[PDB]
Design a binder for this molecule. Sequence first.
Ligand SMILES: COC[C@H]1O[C@@H](O[C@H]2[C@@H](O)[C@@H](NC(C)=O)[C@H](O[C@H]3[C@H](O)[C@H]4N=C(N(C)C)O[C@H]4[C@@H]3CO)O[C@@H]2CO)[C@H](NC(C)=O)[C@H](O)[C@@H]1O
Length: 365
Amino acid sequence: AKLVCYFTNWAQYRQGEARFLPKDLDPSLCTHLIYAFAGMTNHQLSTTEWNDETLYQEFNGLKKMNPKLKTLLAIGGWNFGTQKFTDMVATANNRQTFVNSAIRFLRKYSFDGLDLDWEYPGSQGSPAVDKERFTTLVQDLANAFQQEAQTSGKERLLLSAAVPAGQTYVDAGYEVDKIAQNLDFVNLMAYDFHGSWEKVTGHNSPLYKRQEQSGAAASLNVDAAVQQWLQKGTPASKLILGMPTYGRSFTLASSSDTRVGAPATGSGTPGPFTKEGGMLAYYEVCSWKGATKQRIQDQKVPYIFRDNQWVGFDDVESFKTKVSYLKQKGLGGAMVWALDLDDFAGFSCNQGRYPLIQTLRQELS
Ligand SMILES: COC[C@H]1O[C@@H](O[C@H]2[C@@H](O)[C@@H](NC(C)=O)[C@H](O[C@H]3[C@H](O)[C@H]4N=C(N(C)C)O[C@H]4[C@@H]3CO)O[C@@H]2CO)[C@H](NC(C)=O)[C@H](O)[C@@H]1O
């Protein structure tokens, strides 16, 4: 089974023990390391930090200590927008300029592949025409990769894409069946099902729905998302089940009501290290002493509160549950976002180095 893990190149700017660089990486924890994020400039793949070339080197140099490791560069991201993608896949000469840059770029720095993260083809300002232009971009990359591999005599560059769980987004821009044939694997983003944008406390990554949910409110869980991709043409073995090492917080309207559906005045207090309200790294949900942990029986995931702060998250237990669910489903493995937010150095949770992902590796291997 695969254990696809995302490294993010902005974690390097966090303060103290939270600061994360390639040296904090474990060459053997995951089967595949994906580097987030690379941008675009002139329909060309490009860096985004003043030190991406150096990080690329450390990132890929890890394969010397573990030749079985497979690295990939991810282009895109939630905050990338759709603009540059839609424009690049607009014309042959543009798709080509990109593809050729992708190849030359990946080889230049020793990346084994490209992981597409366009959020999302068919929404956020993307014309429904971008649904099929995506499928082209995929076939194009796949083809140039297969041709390159033969002419260069190296291991064929790998192709993957991060995909949304939501029925709406899938329909809007994904030809599931046709892209799955050209994608080496699909990284399903089964999380963010609920967040501080909604007005009621819900879980970021529930495995199952609560008895109390009917309709589209039901689908807002892992299983629905998984079943949707399978039932639409995705070979189970290519579908990698994503899990989060972060949870989503809410500020409670009243600490008298702390259940999973209670009224929330908005996002939760920013975490001292992540400093982005409405989300919290797993290592921040540990420092929480004098708080109350509970399980959401129906969803198989935990959540906790201390006063007016409510946070739905994943722990070792919920990760074990999930690893078991994908196994029962015959999925290709797990995906995790991100190496970064787990307690990667055992500096907070007193469970060691990478408690969550180490859990994934052992339960999977
Ligand atoms: C660390 O928070 C502050 C930091 O955010 C940067 O933007 C990123 C964050 O908002 C990420 N959010 C979380 C909870 O990690 C966000 O993560 C997204 C990612 O875009 C999507 N891609 C994938 N996969 C698997 C390919 O998964 C999704 C995850 C989880 O929802 O990513 C955005 C960046 O796209 C800020 N940077 C930017 C460019 O906005 C900035 O660094 C800020 O300080």
